[PDB]
């Protein structure tokens, strides 16, 4: 991998050979084709799932939902052409993305139809039917979560990813709980390190010891980060990981900060979230031993938009931990209001 | 950090940010021109080391040895300005670079006046005395190993827009047993990863699960690799690390291969070494329960230059491990000849 780079703190410049990790989260990627195997086989799997009482699917990540949306119509066309009476409905996804107990099957053979959908870009209608294969959406009361699928896809290749941007997928044959490794990359160089995937970008630094620096998340998955793609795993207790192990947090010393316990009650209902160790505008934090115990995350602004100025914590290390979202600022559990009725506070929606 | 990438495996020309780690091992010889900061203080440190009973130095890495061999002159010149009577003699290195019990002092205050170093870096004139502060060489008898120093320097800053970037070293203040972290880099991307430093380049990939791929060695240190710069440290026993922990091997699953134990008696005396999992030319390795027990590693050719064509092992996975050196091709400890007696072959020297 011949390449080059330019420093920003300095002007050191060079090409050469090495290994290069790229940040694709804030860049927002670009248009992806997301070839979901052969739509013929996807149709066969969809039919086979219905025969065994499988209602819908729950998207692990935002890529899966977009792939479903982009292949919706042609799948319906294939179903209509062959002897099938079923409809697929796709809807907006919400966070956090919960785990489904079912897994889509792998058909032994393929539907007897004219296989013309390989590479078909939507733009086709089908006959509506009473029975529908709902994908996410708000189709919950129609069928509860216990009859949904989850994490059944496995990235196959990146054929012509530079310009055609084709991500090839497949249906896996293994039950698993870990996130897809084919899109994970982490590196350390001197006094800086980073863990990243298509939705997570986490940065760590050494200051008297390795610690968490900053994180930017556009999705909240529920798989678990594999160990092989993690730095310095041993010697840490899961009670201390800032990003919960249940929300796909790495098992690392780099994922820790001293004076803070694991954040399992944060505002994980948002769409875009940034973790920053800083005070938000108009707020201050003091350290006192008489402050309250841990509680749900509270927004810095009242429902009407008023701001609470004074907050206290017990045994936290400055700068304080906070979450940044388009709604406003959310503090961690360790920090509690110094003087404020709990009625005006917007409590984080506990995720279960 | 703007990017520069042309991946020939996939032919993707990207341009973004991230973190990049380069392979600098193959061009090590003259990558820097040091001038360790303030040699007027290094002179006082050497004088005090001589006074206290510290009579020599055993180099930790080839970089330090070249630093000595480049600053030998001006240092002697500074000695010949205040009446000090000592002569620094710098010799050649031998592998492995053993460890020294003592540490170089940190002078309380610099010499009364040593500005003669200003404007005279390399071309200087000095005198000679009887006292010797020997660096390296076949000179143990003049300063016994129990009085040599070792591992007394840290890199403060480095990196410049020049073929030879100036490095600002300093005298370490605290005792330590681990290698300097400021020049270590490692990363993993999909199915490939690498650990490296200025003299180590090690590669691993995924097949069933992660395993060692290859390594390139130009020096054999004796410091310990820090944990923070290691991937997946949990669950590995130190008896399976292919590169021994004492010889600066990392504690990782990436540093393991199935069917082989630690290599404590490999041909670690050669100048530079490369590790490959392939046959030595003109030879084959078998797997046989009846083969011999572990022992010292043997060279594939006799001292007379004749080749040995058949080798065996008991429980090793093919292809076999081997060492590529300037002398010739060697086989691992688990691998012994089938019929020819081992006393006829060349045995490697003892290291501990």
């Amino acid at each position, epitope marked *: 991998d011949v390449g080059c780079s330019v420093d920003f703190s300095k002007k050191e410049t060079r090409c050469g050979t090495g290994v290069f990790i790229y940040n694709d989260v804030e860049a927002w990627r670009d248009r992806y084709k997301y070839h979901p195997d052969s739509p013929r086989r996807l149709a066969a799997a969809v039919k086979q799932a219905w025969e065994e009482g499988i209602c819908g699917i729950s998207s692990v990540s935002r890529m899966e939902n977009i792939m479903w949306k982009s292949v919706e119509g042609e799948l319906n066309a294939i179903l209509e052409e062959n002897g099938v009476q079923l409809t697929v409905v796709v809807g907006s996804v919400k966070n956090p993305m919960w785990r489904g107990p079912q897994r889509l099957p792998v058909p032994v053979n393929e539907l007897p139809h004219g296989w013309k959908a390989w590479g078909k870009s939507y733009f086709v209608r089908a006959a509506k039917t009473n029975n529908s294969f709902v994908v996410d959406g708000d189709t919950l009361k129609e069928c509860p979560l216990e009859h949904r699928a989850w994490n059944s896809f496995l990235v196959e290749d990146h054929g012509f990813g530079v310009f055609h941007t084709s991500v090839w997928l497949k249906v896996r044959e293994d*039950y698993s709980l870990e996130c897809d490794p084919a899109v994970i990359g982490t590196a350390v160089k001197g006094r800086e390190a980073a863990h990243s995937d298509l939705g997570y970008w986490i940065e760590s630094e050494k200051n008297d010891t390795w610690r968490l620096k900053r994180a930017h998340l556009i999705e909240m998955k529920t798989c678990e980060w594999p160990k092989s793609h993690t730095l310095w795993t041993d010697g840490v207790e899961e009670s201390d990981l800032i990003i919960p192990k249940s929300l796909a947090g790495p098992l690392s010393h780099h994922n820790t900060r001293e004076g803070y316990r694991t954040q399992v009650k944060g505002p994980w209902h948002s769409e875009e979230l940034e973790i920053r160790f800083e005070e938000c505008p108009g707020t201050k934090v003091y350290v006192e031993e008489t402050c309250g115990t841990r509680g749900p995350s509270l927004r810095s602004t009242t429902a009407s938009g008023r701001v609470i100025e004074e907050w206290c914590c017990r045994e936290c290390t400055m700068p304080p931990l906070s979450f940044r979202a388009k709604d406003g600022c959310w503090y961690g559990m360790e920090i509690r209001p110094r003087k404020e009725p709990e009625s005006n506070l917007v409590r984080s929606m506990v995720t279960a | 950090d703007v990017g520069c990438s042309v991946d020939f495996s996939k032919k993707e020309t990207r341009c973004g940010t991230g973190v990049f780690i380069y392979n600098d091992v193959e061009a090590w010889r003259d990558r820097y021109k040091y001038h360790p900061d303030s040699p007027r203080r290094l002179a006082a440190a050497v004088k005090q080391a001589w006074e206290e009973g510290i009579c020599g130095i055993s180099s930790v890495s080839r970089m330090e040895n070249i630093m000595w061999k480049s600053v030998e002159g001006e240092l002697n010149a500074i000695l010949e300005e205040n009446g000090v009577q000592l002569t620094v003699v710098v010799g050649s290195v031998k592998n492995p670079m053993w460890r020294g019990p003592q540490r170089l002092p940190v002078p309380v205050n610099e010499l009364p006046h040593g500005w003669k170093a200003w404007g005279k870096s390399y071309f200087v004139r000095a005198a000679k005395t009887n006292n010797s502060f020997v660096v390296d060489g076949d000179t143990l008898k003049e300063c016994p190993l129990e009085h040599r120093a070792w591992n007394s320097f840290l890199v403060e800053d480095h990196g410049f827009g020049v073929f030879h970037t100036s490095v600002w070293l300093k005298v370490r203040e605290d005792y330590s047993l681990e290698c300097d972290p400021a020049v270590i880099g490692t990363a993993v991307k999909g199915r490939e990863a690498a650990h490296s430093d200025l003299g180590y380049w090690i590669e691993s990939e995924k097949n069933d699960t992660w395993r060692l791929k290859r390594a390139h060695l130009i020096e054999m240190k004796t410091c310990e690799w820090p944990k923070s710069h290691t991937l997946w440290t949990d669950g590995v026993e130190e008896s399976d690390l292919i590169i021994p922990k004492s010889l600066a091997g990392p504690l990782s699953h990436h540093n393991t291969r199935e069917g082989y134990r630690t290599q404590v008696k490999g041909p670690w005396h050669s100048e530079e070494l490369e590790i490959r999992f392939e046959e030595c030319p003109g030879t084959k390795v078998y797997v046989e329960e009846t083969c011999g027990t572990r022992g010292p590693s043997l060279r594939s050719t006799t001292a007379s230059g004749r080749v040995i064509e058949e080798w065996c092992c008991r429980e090793c996975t093919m292809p076999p491990l081997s060492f590529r050196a300037k002398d010739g091709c060697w086989y691992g400890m688990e691998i012994r000849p089938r019929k020819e007696p081992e006393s006829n072959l060349v045995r490697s020297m003892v290291t501990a």
Partner: antibody
Amino acid sequence: SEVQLVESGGGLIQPGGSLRLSCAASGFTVSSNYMSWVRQAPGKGLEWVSVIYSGGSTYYADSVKGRFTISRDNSKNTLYLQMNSLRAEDTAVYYCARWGGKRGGAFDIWGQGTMVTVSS
Amino acid sequence: SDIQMTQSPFSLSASVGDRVTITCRASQSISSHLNWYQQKPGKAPKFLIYAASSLQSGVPSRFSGSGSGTDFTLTISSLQPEDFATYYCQQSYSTPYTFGQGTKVEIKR
């Protein structure tokens, strides 16, 4: 193919000793499925101990944290448990169970079990 | 913290042909990763129900499970003479994988 799990290596041992348990397998490959060890003390319920993922990760229960070690031999198609610092409190029947292929997270196939007695 | 599973009752008495109700409760939401096992004296457990509503291949149609979240139930339509055993409920959401205490089913006398 028929599927089985068969334990071996039980017996009588003194306090502070060590022993190795072997759980063979047939009809499938242990590399592609999660595997665990479960035990049942005389006159008591069931107890899970440790698990090894198909990728290679391992987890342990506190009662044996550090004293035991789980590993698999990908070539011999076997699952191993290494026991050290044994006590009379470890007396129980030990099982090895297979993680279900498709039916959620469930021990689809169990073994017969082996008896381990720790007494001086 | 670990997930605790509390079975109830400790034991119940019933005859052939009655309806038996067994409840299993979890200390935290576990989605629907719940399982039921049946163990006879001197034997290894057996696998009956997964996902809190699905039946394994070969399980008689009498058994049926329901519930979501924390409260789960097991029911038998027509008790048979060969259903005398103990029942355990297990959760498979995350490690450590905990079991239930178990309930003994006995004949009325």
